[PDB]
Every structure is written in C-alpha cells, then in structure tokens.
Amino acid sequence: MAPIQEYVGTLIYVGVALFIGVAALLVGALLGPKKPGRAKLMPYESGNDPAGEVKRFPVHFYVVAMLFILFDVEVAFLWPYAVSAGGLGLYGFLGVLAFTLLLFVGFLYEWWKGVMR
Amino acid sequence: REGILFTTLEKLVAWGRSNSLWPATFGLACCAIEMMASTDARNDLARFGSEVFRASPRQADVMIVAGRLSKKMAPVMRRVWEQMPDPKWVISMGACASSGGMFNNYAIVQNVDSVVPVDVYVPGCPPRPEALIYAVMQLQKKVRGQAYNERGERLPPVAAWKRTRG
Amino acid sequence: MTLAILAVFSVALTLLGFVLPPQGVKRATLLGLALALASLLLTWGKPFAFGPYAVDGVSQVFTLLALLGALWTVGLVRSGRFEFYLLVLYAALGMHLLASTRHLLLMLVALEALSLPLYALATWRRGQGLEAALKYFLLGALAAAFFLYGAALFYGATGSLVLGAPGEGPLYALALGLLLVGLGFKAALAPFHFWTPDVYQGSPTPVVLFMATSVKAAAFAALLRVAAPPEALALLVALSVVVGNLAALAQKEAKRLLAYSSIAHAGYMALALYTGNAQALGFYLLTYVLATGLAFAVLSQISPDRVPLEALRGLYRKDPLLGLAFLVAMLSLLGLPPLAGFWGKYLAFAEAARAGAWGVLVLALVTSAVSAYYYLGLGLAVFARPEETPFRPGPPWARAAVVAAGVLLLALGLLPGLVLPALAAGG
Amino acid sequence: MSYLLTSALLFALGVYGVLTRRTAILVFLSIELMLNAANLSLVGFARAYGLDGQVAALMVIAVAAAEVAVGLGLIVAIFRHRESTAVDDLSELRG
Amino acid sequence: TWSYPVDPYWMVALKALLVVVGLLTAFAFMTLIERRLLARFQVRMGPNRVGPFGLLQPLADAIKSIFKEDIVVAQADRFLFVLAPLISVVFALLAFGLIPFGPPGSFFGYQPWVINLDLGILYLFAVSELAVYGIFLSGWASGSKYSLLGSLRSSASLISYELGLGLALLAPVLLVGSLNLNDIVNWQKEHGWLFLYAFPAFLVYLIASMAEAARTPFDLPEAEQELVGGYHTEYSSIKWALFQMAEYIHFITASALIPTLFLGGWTMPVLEVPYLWMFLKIAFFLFFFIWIRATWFRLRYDQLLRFGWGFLFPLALLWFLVTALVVALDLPRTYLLYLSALSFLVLLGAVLY
Amino acid sequence: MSLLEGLALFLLLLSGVLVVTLRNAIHAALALILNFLVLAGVYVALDARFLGFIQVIVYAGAIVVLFLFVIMLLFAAQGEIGFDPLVRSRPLAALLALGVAGILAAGLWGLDLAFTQDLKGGLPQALGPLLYGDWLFVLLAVGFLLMAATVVAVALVEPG
Amino acid sequence: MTLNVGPQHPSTHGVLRLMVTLSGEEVLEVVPHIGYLHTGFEKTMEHRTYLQNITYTPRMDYLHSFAHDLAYALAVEKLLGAVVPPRAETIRVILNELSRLASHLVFLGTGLLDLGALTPFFYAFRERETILDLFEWVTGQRFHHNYIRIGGVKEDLPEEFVPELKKLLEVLPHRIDEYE
Ligand code: SF4
C-alpha cells in the first residue's frame, strides 16, 4: 500500500532542488565581467574546428539505443513477476522462462554478427 | 565584476582567487619535463592550490608560457591565448620564452611579450624547478596586491588585465 | 498446435540458419510452413482453445490460404536472402494469431505483428521500395491510433476487452467504427486505400502477392469477428468499387491496377458481412485467393518487379499453358461461370439481399460489369502482340502449381457445392 | 470525465500536429502523443472497470515502442543517403 | 509508508533543504580529501597550507569559480546551454532523500530519511536515465560535433550499463519480496545481509556501479589526453563545476546504494548503533573506489562494449534467472546460499591469476 | 479536487500545444517529456503507480532519447527546411481538429459510470495474477513481437 | 570528420598538427603538418664556435643529451686527430648510459601516463630525480649537461659521487621490476 503523503513529499524534494539550482544560476548570470569573446567563440581542438568533413555517422549508436528499448521493456515485466512470484507458482516461472529465452535470441543474433557493423 | 563592496570583500575575493590559482601550463619545448618535474614527487603544488591542471584553458586562466616559439607557431599560440576567459595571467617561463636566448634567426620569434602581456618573467632555461615555485609564489603575492617594482614603482595586482578580451 | 510449430520453429531457425546456406534455409522454411499447415489438416473438424486463444474452423480456413501463399512466394525467389524468408514466417504466424482470438488487444497486436516485417520485405533494396514502405508504415501507425482509441472505448463501453458485449448505443456505436478504421486500412478498404497501388508499384511482385493475399484475408477474417452498421459498410463498399474501377481506366501499369482490383473485391467481400456468414465468406476468399495468387505468379515469371501492361502481351506464344492460365485468371476475376467467382459473388449477394440493401447492391452489380473492360483488355492480349521482350522460364515448381490452380479454379467452378457443405463450422 | 475530455483534446491536438507538419519526424512525434492520450483514457475506464486497463496500457506502450523503433529504423534508412526530412517531397510513386 | 506514519509537509521541507546543502558540503570535503589521499599514496604530500590541511580551499575554489562569465559562443543554443547542467544536477540531487539513515522516525523523533518508498528501486532507476538526457544535450547545446560525438559514445554506453543495473535490482527484490528499502533492511535484520545471498549479483552490481561515470570505465573521457569528453570542454566557469559536481553526486549516491543493497543501510549484527554503521560503509566504498581510481586504468570502450554486451548483461540475467528459479520454487533458499558463496569462490579460483 | 486538478490539466494541455507548434525539434521533444511528467503525476493521482513509473522509464528514458539520437544524427533541430507544397491545408487541418473532438465529446456527454471500486490499484501485487495467467498469451506474443522487431531493425540497417 | 589535431591538444606532451582523415572509427590516413618548432640551429651554429656549439646539442634531444654530445665530440676529435683518456671514455659512457636510462624513464613515463593510469609516472620521476640529482652534482646542472670539454670532460668526478651512484644502482633493479 502507500501513503498519498509521500508523493506530496516527492513534489517537495523537487521544488527545493530547483530553487537552489536557480540560485546558483542567478549568481552565474549576473557576476563576472561583461567582456565578450569574438573568436574564442571558435572551437577548442587547438583553435581548430571539428569541421573538416560533414558526413553520416555510425548506426552503432542506433543499434545500441534500439536494443536498450527492447530490453527496458523486458525488465518492465520482470518487475511484476518479482512482486508476485512464488504465489504464481511453477506456471508463473515457466511463462517467464519462455519469454526470457525469446529476448536472449536478440542478444545471440548480435553475438555472432557483432555490434560493430 | 570581480569581488568588491567595501575594502574587506574585494581583498577577500582576491585572496580566494589567488590561493586557488589554477595553472594551465602550455608546454612547447624543453620546459615541459621540468614542469612535470615541478609537479611530481618531492615537488608539491599541493598546498599551493596549483595541484590543479585542466586541458581546457577555458577552465583555467594562468598561462605558463613554457617552451620555445616559432613564427609558424606564433599565430597559433595567439589564438590559444585568445581562447582564455576574462581574468588571465602570463607567466613567461624560463629564458627561451622570456627573450629567446642564443637563437637569433631570421627564422624565429623572440621575446614573447610581443604578442602577449607578461606579468612574470622567470628566466633560466631551465631554471631550478623551485624557481617556478618561487614564481607562483610571486604571482600569488602579486595578485595579493602588495605588488611593486624595484624602481619604486607600484605594480597593480593585475597588469594583464591591462590587455583585455572585450 | 500449429501455433506451437510456428513459435518454436521460428525461434530455432533464427540462429540455426547461419549453419545452413540460404538455400538450406529456404528448404527449411518450406518445411516448417508445410508442417504447420499439415497440423491444421490433421486437426480439421475440432476446435482447440487454450485460453482466449482459440483456433476455430474459420481461422483454420484462412490460415490454410495464407500459409499457402507464403510458401509459393518463397518458392518464387532464390535470388533473395534468408531474412526475407524469416520475416515472412514471422508475419504468417502473426496472422494466425490474429484470427484465433476474440481478445481485442491481442488482435491489435497481431495487426502490428504482421505489418512490421512487411515493411522490411517491401524492398529489394530499391529506392522505390522504401518510399512505398514508408507511407504504408506511417499510415498504418495512424490507423493504429484510431484502432487503439476504439479499443479503449470498448473498455470504456464495458469492462470487456474481448468481442461480445452489446452496450447501449452511441458510445458503443462510435467505438465500433474505429475498429472498422484499423481493419479498414488493413484490408485497404476505401477510403483507406490510396497507398496500396503506389506501394505495389514500389514493391516487387512476390512480396506483393503475399501482401495482397494474406493481409486482406486476415483483415476480412478478423473483421468478421466484429459486427457493424450496414450503412457504414455500404459507404465503404461504394467508394471501393467505384474508385477502383475508375482509376483502373487511368491505368497503364499492372501493379497499381491489381491493387484497385482487389479493392473492388474488398467491397464485394464486405457484403458478406451483413450476415457475417463465413461459409459464404470463407468460400469467396478461398476462391478469390486462387485467382489472385495465379495472377501474380504469372506476373513474376514476367518480372518480379514492375512492368507495365503492354510488356505482358503475347504470353500464349511464350507458353501456351501460361497463356491459358492467365486467361482463366482474368475471367475468374471477372467472376464468371463456370468459375467459382460467380458463385462467390452470388453468395455475398445473397447475404446482401437478406440485409435488404438494394441501391448499394444494384450499384455493385453495375460496377461488376465495368471491371470486364480490363480483364479482356489483358486476356485477349495474351494471344496478340507478337513482340517478345524479357521473359523468365522459371522452375517446374511454379509451372505445374499454376496449371493445377487454373484447373482448380474451374473445378470449383463446376463443383463449388463440394467443399462448401462442410465449410465453416467454427471448429 | 474531465480527464476523458482532456484525452480527446490531446488526440485532436496530435492530429493538428500531424497535418500541419510535412516534416515526417515531427509527424511521427505527434503520433506518439496521441497514443498516450489513449493510455490516459484507459486509466479513466480503469476507475470504472477495475484496472485491466493498466495492464492494457502496458501492453500498448510496449507496442508503441516497438513501432517507434522500426519507424525510426526506416526513417534512418531513408535519409542514410538522402537529405530530405519532409517526405511528400519524395513522391516518386504517384500516379 | 502506510506501515510507518508520515511527517507533515513543512517538516519534510526542512529536512529536504538540510540534506541538500548537506550533500554540497559532503562533496566539498570529499574532493579535498581525495586529492590529498591520492598524494600520500603517490609519494607526495597533499595540501597542508591555506588550511592547515587545505581546509579552507574548497571555499577558495568556489570563490575563484565565480566572477567569471560562463562564456556563450556564437552558434549557441541559449536555453539548452543553461538548462543542460541544471537538469542533471537536479536529477543527481534527487534520489537520496528516499534513503533512511537509521531506524524509523528515530532521528530525534523525526524521520531519518526525507522521503521513502514502497516502490523504491524504480524511482532510482528512473532518475538515473534523466541525467543522461543532460549529457548529450549539453553536447548539442554547445554545437560542437566533437563534443557531441563523444556524448553519443557516452550516453549510449552509460545507457547500456543502466540496463545491467536493472537486472541486478531484480534479485534482492525477490528475496525480500519488495523494493521497499525499509523492508529490505528489515529483512536483513532478521535473515541477514544481501551480500551473503547472491555473491555473483554483488559482483555484477559493483561492476555496474562503475558505470555511473566512476572511472575505470574511464574512457569517460575527459579532454585531458583523449578525444574529448562532452558536457565540459566548451563550458567554463560555474557550469563546468556543475558537470563535475554531478558526477560526484552520482558517485556518492552510488557509494550509498551498494551498501544499501548488499549490506543494508546502517545496521550491524554485532551491536546496534544507529548512525555510525551507515557512514562507515559509505566511507569504505568511497575508499575502495579511490583504490580503483589509482590502480586501474582506461579501457578502450570497444573493450567495454564487448564486455557489457557480450558478458555482463546476459550473464546477469542468467544469474538472476537462477535466483528467480529458487524463489519461484519456494524451496529452502539454503541451497542457493550454498551455491552463491561457492560459485564466487569457483569463479575467482578458475581465473585465479 | 478541481483546483489543483484543474491546473494540472491546463498545464498538460499546454505542453501538448507546444509540441505541435514547435519547429524546434528539440524544444518540441522536451515539452513532450514534461507532458509525460504531468501525465505520470496524474497517474499516481489516479492511483496508478506502476504505470506512472513505466511511463517515465520507457518514454522519457528510452523512447525520446532514441528519437533525439536520430534527429541529431540527421542534423535537423528544425523542420523549417523548406516551404510547404500546401499551406491552404493549415486552416483545413484546424477545421477537422474541432470536428473530431466534437463527435467524441457528444458521445461522452451521454454517460457517466462508476469511477470507484478499488483504490491503490497501481500496485503490481494484484496485477501479477492477471498478467500471469490470462494476459500471458499477450505476453508471449509481445515477447516475440519484440524479437521480430529486433531482427527487422537489423535488417533495416545492413542486409543479410 | 577531417579533424585537425593541433599542437598540444588534447594535452599531448608533444605538439604538431595532424589532418586526421577519419573514416568513422577506423582512421583513413594522417597528413602530418609541423614546422611549429623549427629554428635553424645549424645556421646559427655556423656563426658560432665549435665549443659554443656544444650548448646547442642538449637543446635537440634532452632526454638523452649525451649522445649528441658524444657524437659531436668524437667527430671533431677524430677530425683534427685527438685522443681521449681511458678514464674519460669510461665515465662518458657511464653518463651516456645514465642519460639513456633517463630517456627511457621519460619514454615509459609518458606511455604509462598517457593511456592508462597516470600514477606510475610519479615513481619513475622519483628515480628520474635521482638521476638528475646525480647530474646536478657533476655538471652543476639539472640538465642540458655539459662536462665534456672535448677530449674528456672538464675535470674528474666528485668522490662523493661514487657512493651516491651506488645507492641508486641498488634500488633500481628492485624498483624496475614492479614497473615492468
Ligand atoms: S626556458 Fe628553460 S625550461 Fe624552458 S624551454 Fe628553455 S630550457 Fe626548457
């Protein structure tokens, strides 16, 4: 069960953090000299820009991201199972086991193939 | 905006700043190993607040011009200098920087202050590590606002807030 | 059961296929399907539930058809890749799942299950096959949202999450429509159709065969488990048959044409729904499938990629048998006697007349005449246009299969009263 | 009931989104919002009918995610050698 | 919870506010100490001046940090630039009020914790994702594709490991039957600490807790001597500190979580002294990390990815599954106790070198 | 009730407004997260706790991030990239929007039900048995669905 | 991208500018660009005494000064014909090899620091200091060592030097192993 109270408490926590946040920033905004750059606005790779080529970049990042989603969903379910489990007995367990094995295929596919593509 | 209300406050802030100074060293030649020396081991920048080293000079402000400088390297360096935020100091480390020794080529740059302010000279190529320590003590106490010159001339705690970025 | 085979086989096969060369995997896939199909046969005439998952006669029938289609299509391509089999496998299974439950959410899920890999299958990697794909996906997800909204209103209208609840009127009335929306897109009923010709143009023939068969089947199938106002239906149908035929005048390309055609057919199928008689509708779709199957098979041996109408012509020369097959097809699609299509048409019509919807029904009859234009437009062309351009002679596999089909067409043309008696028992 | 009005509004809004934007990804974004409108609805009905709509929601969610992924995969693959972003722009198929 | 009565909202606020600045001061003196503590190890001596023992230096550092305009570039994303640190720091702060420190209500009649939940882990897990939002955003904000590309590496990687944490958190939740912290502790109060019960999950959790940017992952990057890290590099004044700050708070949050989990929070079988035992665990894990920080290196991310992906996450769930089996099967849990301990011994001994 | 309750729905709706206006992709996306924040809060308020957390976990945690990685990948923080092939369609969009709500509203006027038969429903405790046993079919479907998705996803990127 | 990895960036001990054609994770090719520390010693020294020139040698490589030193010394000595005391060559070699060790210290020092943990550096430096201290004694200088006056060094070692040298030879084996 739960007290509605603690959710209130949640909101509390967040509001505090934001104030202190904002305080730091208000300091930041107003303080210091008001002297601008005009060429320090150009990047730090030695004053060099990373500009030199513009192209399309690895699907690697997609792959990982996508992966994570699926498995995050996986996890999602295993939490309820975690809650009610022994009470669900062996039939509980078997279902989950099946399911799990399915997602393991995703992994395995990617193990022989390799995430680097 | 740099620390002041009454007397107390600015001196406070300046003390804070001075004792926390963050070295961005800018190696370029023989200096570097002696600088690495100046950090390491039985050498201590520890209690000197300068145990702090950060690759971004956007995140550091004390420039230790440590090496030897070419014509070809000069504009580069120029931008490097340029890429510092508002408070910012130039130590001219060792002789090579300060004026450039024996090399007197038609192929070189000499006497680095041409392209930058200088607050501190520390000659010797190399000097003893300790001299640099001494230097940072200097630069510390310079910024402490006790700064003077030997011609009896007052030296303000800034003199490279006398070459400005905007 | 059959389902059992699917899930397992799919899973196993996934990794296994690496060991095999793609041809060995093609071999594999062929086997699996055939087994799953087998398992239907051997269980034909008993219903088996396990939960809301409940395989019934109706389901059974439609998945006979579907599995068939997928086997064929794989049949046709050896220049592909094993993934392009796997996904089909998957999809089929997804459609099996669709039919054998009346639990709405599963049904929804099933739609997604079938639609996703289809998109991927939508390309021989050509640029076209990505545009096509994209649209279809995008539209699909939109319709999804509706279908989802409908479902939510069912849970709204009753605590039920499974078909069979009567509610009151308006909310429930509303809610049901949005289910028709989903289904509509999936069967590509007008006015949820625009994309389908275009997508066909973009997509290579074998794929299209499969899509144009199975998905429609599935859609009507599932649609049947739902029930609906006759007025809505009448609208849909009208638009489908009219627009279909009108745009078919505009045509100059096979791929788009056939889409339009199968929209007209969808209109016709939707008639049946007035009673929801799946003896009638069962029969129809079965027969419809054959013809439709036939048509694309032929087209593949031409090109398994887009080819305009003209290119096709002179087929009897190329092979006599092929010329006759394709010919028969056109007539079948006209739904003539002594081809099963006439009866199929009739049966639907009988359910319509019970429903007492006249105007519609009449119009339907009119436009069923219209269609004949393009069927002869092709069918005679077969013998004519003696110029020959790219033709592919294919395997014995397909040739035999196809000629079996064209005869089978005319066989139920003469004995449609054979299977139908012991059709659609619901278990 | 209020909440249920709200849900419908969000559905409507998303549509206005989808229709205005010709940039595909922003469409896709909109779609997602509509989907969530749904899940809210479910919750309302859960207060009537007993929390099956929670489980519902969860299933739905998962599906949404799935379709997201795939859609983005496609989106990716389309502009993996093409620079457009609004996609009626591409109209190779047309007739 | 409902099982324990609540404080009125004002008093919550008071506590919240306190603990927030408490954690500020926490980090402060920690850096100071870490710096120095490294020095000793590293045959050098730390601060001993401006202190003495450099005790006033953090203040000094802060004062330095301010009075410098945090630079804005042309080609900036105004809102995001400011926003991106805020957010992260917000989400770093958050999730610690949750945690108790002593027995219920027993902080001078008021609750040790600030908040608490029945549904503990979820919150934690949830908040952890949102920092990462910050990560790549900062990148983007800066409009440096150098920074950006790094942030993608980073975020991606982070997120992979984020997943392993989940699979870890399933395991004790089995045992206690819940993710309510109090209850988890209390379970251990009777039955015993969780490091007993699932030694290989302890392992993976540790190694997952690395991933909170904790180095030895450490192609984190930083700009120093690498393809630069995101976040920083294009920032300057206070904002840079913020990034750093956040990273430390994660570190510190983590320094609590691992005790919470495997040993429980406070709590000793040998004597009950409330506050003490907590700090002591904290302290330990801290020091332990610092040993890591020194004596361990940089991977090459490629390695790391292979590692998590190929080994850790499947293996983590594999172990979990075992445990889930035990708990499902409702037998004596003893056999698992037996197995875990042994399996660790095995899995160390197998590769003793 | 309706004081705070009222506000939260105003805000929620507001977040919605933003995302369909915004032609700063990033700004858009960001709003949508804030949306889910509210929505989650409201979930909890309507005693759906689990659902609350998952909303966050999935959408914000995973989903939008993935989205973002792509739009960053494709270097467009704005949909302002051209100008529209039709602009007439804007008011027409706005027309239709009103209609689609109107019909739903009408439908929904004519009823009220219970809203009341449990409390503290967001607890996975009582939800487990249903899922596990009855929604189990769906579960298995889902699980496969994901797997298929994976494979698909792969196939999208490199062939095989 | 084509990254122009410039001088000192990221924190590179060395400097130079590199146009890194990066394929994506696997580099394509690096087009090196230097000239950022050229001087033209050789000219200046042709405007100097040979003796003077001996100061220029440590400014080349300084990690091992003595090789330069030696190489030049010898070359000249040879050139106009000269001999070297035995004791001289012995010492000179000692110093040379000591400078060799120094060089290695720096080589490995940077390696360890650069990738991987920073730490091992500090110990190597401790030892390096010792070496340097040894040098301070004998040449009056930390480095840029000068002692060689061509034909030997300037004068013989300190006697105190010999003990101290021993010390470091004791430690170093033991010390080395753990670094290795
Ligand atoms: S000034 Fe002295 S320490 Fe520096 S580069 Fe010259 S020799 Fe090296």
- Cβ-in-10-Å burial (0-12, 13-18, 19+) of C55 comes to buried
Cα(B20)–Cα(C50) distance, integer angstroms: 74
State which CATH number among 3.40.50.720, 3.20.20.70, 3.40.50.12280, 3.10.180.10 fits the domain covering B1-160: 3.40.50.12280
The phi, psi pair for E119, rounded to 5°, reads -100, 70
Q: Is G24 on the interface with A (CB under 8 A)?
A: yes
Nearest CA to ligand 1 atom 2: B125
Q: What is the number of structural domains in chain E?
A: 1
CB contact under 8 A, G1 and E227: no
Minimal CA separation from C23 to chain A, in Å: 20
* Crossing angle of helices C104-121 and C170-187, rounded to 10°: 20
Distance E315 CA to ligand 1 centre (A): 55
* Position in ligand 1 atom list of the atom nearest CA B97: 1
At position G179, the amino acid (one-letter code) is: Y
- Class of the CATH domain delimited by A1-116: mainly alpha
The phi, psi pair for E16, rounded to 5°, reads -60, -55
Cα(E160)–Cα(E211) distance, integer angstroms: 9
Distance G48 CA to ligand 1 centre (A): 21
Nearest CA to ligand 1 atom 4: B31
- Cβ-in-10-Å burial (0-12, 13-18, 19+) of C145 comes to buried
| Intra-chain end-to-end CA distance of chain D, in Å | 46
Cα(E345)–Cα(A84) distance, integer angstroms: 32
The binding-site residues of ligand 1, defined as CB within 6 angstroms of any ligand atom, are B 29-31, 34, 66-68, 93-97, 124-126
Cα(C362)–Cα(C357) distance, integer angstroms: 9
Domain boundaries, chain F: 1-160
Minimal CA separation from D95 to chain A, in Å: 33
Specify the fold of F1-160: Four Helix Bundle (Hemerythrin (Met), subunit A) (1.20.120)
Elucidation method: cryo-EM
Domain boundaries, chain A: 1-116
Q: What is the CA radius of gyration of chain E?
A: 21
Cα(B101)–Cα(B124) distance, integer angstroms: 10
Cα(B97)–Cα(B26) distance, integer angstroms: 11
By residue count, chain F amounts to: 160
Q: Among residues E167, E90, E169, which one has the least CA distance to residue E130? A: E90
Cα(A37)–Cα(E236) distance, integer angstroms: 13
Q: Ligand 1, residues B26, B33, B68: which to mutate, most atoms within 8 A of Cβ? A: B68
3-state helix, strand, coil in chain F (%, to 5): 70, 0, 30
User: Residue D93: which of C112, C131, C148 has the nearest Cβ?
Assistant: C131
Q: Among residues G126, G128, G136, which one has the least CA distance to residue G160? A: G136
- G110 chain-E contacts, CB cut-off 8 A: none
Cβ contacts of E86 within 8 Å, gap of 6 or more: A21, A25, E242
Cα(E4)–Cα(E181) distance, integer angstroms: 12
Q: What is the CA radius of gyration of chain C?
A: 20
Cα(B99)–Cα(B109) distance, integer angstroms: 9
Ordered alpha helix ranges (H), G55-85: 66-80
Structure-token match 């910050």, residue found: E134
Minimal CA separation from F130 to chain C, in Å: 13
Q: Is D90 on the interface with A (CB under 8 A)?
A: no
CB contact under 8 A, D74 and C201: no
User: Residue D45: which of C145, C152, C199 has the nearest Cβ?
Assistant: C152
Residue of A nearest to C17 (CA): A109
Cα(G25)–Cα(C230) distance, integer angstroms: 62
Q: What tokens does D6 get?
A: 């709200």
Helices H, strands E: what count in chain D? 3, 0
Distance B142 CA to ligand 1 centre (A): 23
Structure-token match 């009220």, residue found: F112
Cα(B69)–Cα(C73) distance, integer angstroms: 73
Subunits adjacent to chain A (3 or more Cβ pairs under 8 Å):
B, C, D, E, F, G
Cα(F142)–Cα(F130) distance, integer angstroms: 16
Domain boundaries, chain C: 1-427
Distance B7 CA to ligand 1 centre (A): 40
B125 is in an annotated binding site: yes
CB contact under 8 A, C130 and D74: yes
DSSP conformation class of E94: S
Structure-token match 């200098």, residue found: B81
CB contact under 8 A, E240 and B15: no
DSSP conformation class of F88: T
Q: Ligand 1, residues B25, B93, B120: which to mutate, most atoms within 8 A of Cβ? A: B93
Minimal CA separation from G37 to chain B, in Å: 5
Distance B123 CA to ligand 1 centre (A): 8
Angle at G69 between CA G66 and CA G74, to 5 degrees: 120
CB contact under 8 A, A45 and G4: yes
- E126 chain-F contacts, CB cut-off 8 A: 53, 56-57, 61
Cα(F76)–Cα(F26) distance, integer angstroms: 9
- B56 chain-G contacts, CB cut-off 8 A: none
Q: Among residues C203, A62, C86, which one has the least CA distance to residue D73? A: A62
**Cβ contact A69:E160 at 8 Å:** no
Cα(B136)–Cα(B132) distance, integer angstroms: 6
For C284, E212, F116, F137, the CA distances from C152, given in Å and listed in that order, are 32, 40, 18, 19
User: How many Å separate Cα E79 from the centre of its chain?
Assistant: 28
Q: Is E75 on the interface with A (CB under 8 A)?
A: yes
SS3 G27: strand
Half-sphere exposure for C213 (CA within 13 Å, toward CB):
33
B96 is in an annotated binding site: yes
Minimal CA separation from F107 to chain E, in Å: 38
User: Residue C116: which of F107, F111, F148 has the nearest Cβ?
Assistant: F148
CB contact under 8 A, B42 and G126: yes
Q: Which helix or strand (DSSP H or E) is residue G28 part of?
A: strand G27-33
D1-95 CATH: 1.10.287.3510
Cα(C270)–Cα(E106) distance, integer angstroms: 72
Q: G27-33 and B120-122 as β-strands: parallel, antiparallel, unpaired?
A: unpaired
CB contact under 8 A, E71 and B85: yes
Q: Among residues C325, C329, C304, C312, which one has the least CA distance to residue C386? A: C312
* Position in ligand 1 atom list of the atom nearest CA B66: 4
At position C399, the amino acid (one-letter code) is: R
CB contact under 8 A, C145 and D90: no
Minimal CA separation from C53 to chain D, in Å: 17
Q: Does residue B75 come out as left (phi exceeding 0), alpha (psi in the -120 to 50 range) or beta?
A: alpha
The phi, psi pair for F101, rounded to 5°, reads -80, -35
Q: Is D60 on the interface with F (CB under 8 A)?
A: no
User: Residue D71: which of C137, C145, C250 has the nearest Cβ?
Assistant: C137
**Cβ contact C259:C200 at 8 Å:** yes
Torsion of Cα atoms, C310 then C314 then C320 then C326, to 10°: 20
* Position in ligand 1 atom list of the atom nearest CA B93: 1
Q: Is F26 on the interface with D (CB under 8 A)?
A: no
For C266, C340, C395, C408, the CA distances from C400, given in Å and listed in that order, are 29, 21, 9, 12
Q: Is E123 on the interface with F (CB under 8 A)?
A: yes
For A62, C97, C202, D70, the CA distances from C112, given in Å and listed in that order, are 22, 11, 21, 11
**Cβ contact E158:E128 at 8 Å:** no
User: Residue B82: which of A32, A36, A40 has the nearest Cβ?
Assistant: A40
- Cβ-in-10-Å burial (0-12, 13-18, 19+) of C39 comes to middle
Nearest CA to ligand 1 atom 7: B125
Interface test with B, best of E33, E38, E63 (most B CBs within 10 A): E63
At position C190, the amino acid (one-letter code) is: A
Distance G130 CA to ligand 1 centre (A): 20
Cα(B75)–Cα(F9) distance, integer angstroms: 59
CB contact under 8 A, E234 and B47: no
